[PDB]
Ligand binder design. Structure first.
Ligand code: ZN
Length: 84
RNA sequence: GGAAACCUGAUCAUGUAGAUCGAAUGGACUCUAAAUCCGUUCAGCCGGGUUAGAUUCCCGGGGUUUCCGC
């Protein structure tokens, strides 16, 4: 709740993209105001460590459109995302 | 010094999962090419409020533009 994006990812261990797709985070590291994230499916992204970004809002949702196939998100992980 | 408008890839929009463009990446296709297409990924400048719920509304900071100032 109004927390930086690194806190939300570090808590859930998951990510939700602009399309509502859930990915499992394999690695993430902070540097200055930036975050470098590697998903289990292989994607690499670099985002701002903001309290107001779309990913920060999306992690604060209790909805999702689909899960990443290659990330193999478990029903347990999905449940832990739905029940923050 | 003060006032108003806007906000960081671009343009626009916006209290109830923003959109279009652009870029990165994989694939299809192709001649291991071009063109074309598809999948995946990328946002709210910062800090507090209000709210069931905030990029959106309020206050403050910062930046830009414009206007009014000894
Ligand atoms: Zn994934």
């Amino acid at each position: 709740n109004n927390k930086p994006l690194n806190t939300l990812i570090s808590a859930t261990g998951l990510w939700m993209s602009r399309t509502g797709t859930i990915h499992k985070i394999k690695h993430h590291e902070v540097s200055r105001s930036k975050i470098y994230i590697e998903m289990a499916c292989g994607d690499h992204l670099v985002v701002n460590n903001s309290r107001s970004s779309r990913p920060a809002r999306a992690l604060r949702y209790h909805k999702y459109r689909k899960t990443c196939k290659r990330c193999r998100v478990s029903d347990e992980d999905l449940n832990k995302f739905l029940t923050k």
